[PDB]
């Protein structure tokens, strides 16, 4: 998380951390608990290549990584079939947990939006994660979960910004309709934040607007962070998730 502060213990109970085997079960991506048996993450975290599930574990909402770990096994990885790369689109995946989580005050699910939800600018949105604090800058120990309020930008506005200082033709779409834009040069998500949620307050309820997907660098001029528009893939998500 570029910009923003350390999240309070209470906030973001749906926040998960994806772990990879090695000298330790290291953090590499985030995700959200959308059901007691399901995690919503980015496809680029777990694909396009088929991954050995022995090399993956999920960690539920805790303040700091590695200090109070209880690693959960994954039974299935479901990557959107239309996914190849983040810039192409369909950067969304589901993880089915081997065991259902016992929901509580500190650990519970995030609400997905209705299809009709557009998430226009002005919307109070927040992105959360344990990823990079700046470009090629890791989150230092004790690894606190970080949060940042990010401004929503319209797709065409964002798409126009992405063309500034680029050879790509103006008629050539960069920011695709399954994507959403948020951030500026001070507030943004970064590498290690992927799969993590972009949540917005809509009539007193937190709805996951997006999934941390990609962007050119981290909090770069005319390069807002790009997210997978959750509304676009609702039908796919709900084919698996109750």
């Amino acid at each position, epitope marked *: 998380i570029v910009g923003g502060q350390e999240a309070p213990r209470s906030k973001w109970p749906w926040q998960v951390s994806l772990r990879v085997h090695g000298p330790y079960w290291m953090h590499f991506c985030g995700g959200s608990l959308i059901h007691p048996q399901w995690v919503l993450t980015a496809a680029h975290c777990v694909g396009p290549d088929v991954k050995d599930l*022995a090399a993956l574990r999920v960690q539920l909402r805790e303040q700091h990584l590695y200090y109070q770990d209880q*690693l959960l*096994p994954v*039974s299935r990885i479901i990557v959107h079939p239309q996914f190849y790369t983040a810039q192409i689109g369909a950067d969304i995946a589901l993880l089915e947990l*081997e*065991e259902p989580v016992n929901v509580s005050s500190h650990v519970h699910t995030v609400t997905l939006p209705p299809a009709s939800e557009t998430f226009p600018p002005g919307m109070p949105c927040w992105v959360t994660g344990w990823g990079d604090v700046d470009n090629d800058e890791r989150l230092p120990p004790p690894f606190p979960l970080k949060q940042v309020k990010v401004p929503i930008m319209e797709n065409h506005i964002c798409d126009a910004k992405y063309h500034l200082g680029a050879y790509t033709g103006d008629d050539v779409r960069i920011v695709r309709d399954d994507m959403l834009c948020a951030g500026n040069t001070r507030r943004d998500s970064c590498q290690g934040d992927s799969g993590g949620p972009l949540v917005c307050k809509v009539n007193g309820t937190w709805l996951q607007a997006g999934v941390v997907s990609w962007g050119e660098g981290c909090a770069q001029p005319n390069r807002p962070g790009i997210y997978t528009r959750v509304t676009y893939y609702l039908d796919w998500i709900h084919h698996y998730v109750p």
Partner: antibody, heavy 122, light 111 residues
Framework: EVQLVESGPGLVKPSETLSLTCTVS????????ITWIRQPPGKGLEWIGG???????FYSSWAKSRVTISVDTSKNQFSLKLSSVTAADTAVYYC????????????????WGQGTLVTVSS | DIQMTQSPSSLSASVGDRVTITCQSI???????LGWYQQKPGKAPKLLIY???ILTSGVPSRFSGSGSGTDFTLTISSLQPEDFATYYC???????????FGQGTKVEIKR
């Protein structure tokens, strides 16, 4: 170079409780699951139960009542406790690892212990 | 309970012979959750094949796993003298305790 080791009494008197420990030398097993299997002499493999990556216990049809599996992270150990033993419990006790950290799996027990013979006799 | 059937219970074959051991269940295997073990006398079983067809590293290519749902097969393309052991299949039907082993198959060399 990775080793699992079963430790415990070789001889147990009936009605008593067999206590076995599965230790892991020069290797940690935080994200893994340990399951216990037994093999009566001349008979085949039988599942006792197991503990998941998230410290969740799963016990077989039989045993549920008289079996307890636990983890001592501080000791890098797994326990098995089988109460009210009879000569029917005389077997070779194995502890094996599920590298997916499942707890109720049997289809991918990659690392195994050497096996420990437990004889239930007066 | 126990509900997995291996066929045959025991077999005898010459060196170089193709050996086929079948594992059958009434309920379908959960998520390709079917593995094959080789147990040499007085030794812990060895995982040869996992997740139906995936071969454990180091295990000879003469060992292959095939099948789906309720019917599975372990194949030994060219039986070697060292291949003498009891072979057990093991599967999962759910993620909460419905896992068993097959009765086993004693493979014996003919000479």
């Amino acid at each position: 170079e990775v080793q699992l080791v079963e430790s415990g009494p070789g001889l147990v008197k009936p009605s008593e409780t067999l206590s076995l420990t599965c230790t892991v030398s020069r290797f940690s097993l935080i994200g893994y699951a340990i399951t216990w299997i037994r093999q009566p002499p001349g008979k085949g493999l039988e599942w006792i139960g197991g503990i998941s990556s998230a410290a969740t216990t799963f016990y077989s049809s039989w045993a549920k009542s008289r079996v307890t599996i636990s983890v001592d992270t501080s000791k890098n150990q797994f326990s098995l406790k089988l109460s009210s033993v009879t000569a029917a419990d005389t077997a070779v006790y194995y502890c094996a690892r599920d590298p997916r950290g499942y707890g109720a799996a049997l289809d991918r027990l990659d690392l195994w212990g050497q096996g420990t013979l437990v004889t239930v006799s007066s | 309970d126990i509900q997995m059937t291996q066929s045959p219970s025991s077999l005898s074959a010459s060196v170089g012979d193709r050996v086929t051991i079948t594992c059958q269940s009434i309920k379908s295997v959960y998520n390709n959750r079917l593995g094959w073990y080789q147990q040499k006398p007085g030794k812990a079983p060895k995982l040869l094949i996992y997740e139906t067809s995936i071969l454990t590293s180091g295990v000879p290519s003469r060992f292959s796993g095939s099948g789906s749902g309720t019917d599975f097969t372990l194949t030994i393309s060219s039986l070697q003298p060292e291949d003498f052991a009891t072979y057990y299949c093991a599967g999962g039907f759910d993620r909460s305790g419905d896992t068993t082993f097959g009765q086993g198959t004693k493979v014996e060399i003919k000479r």
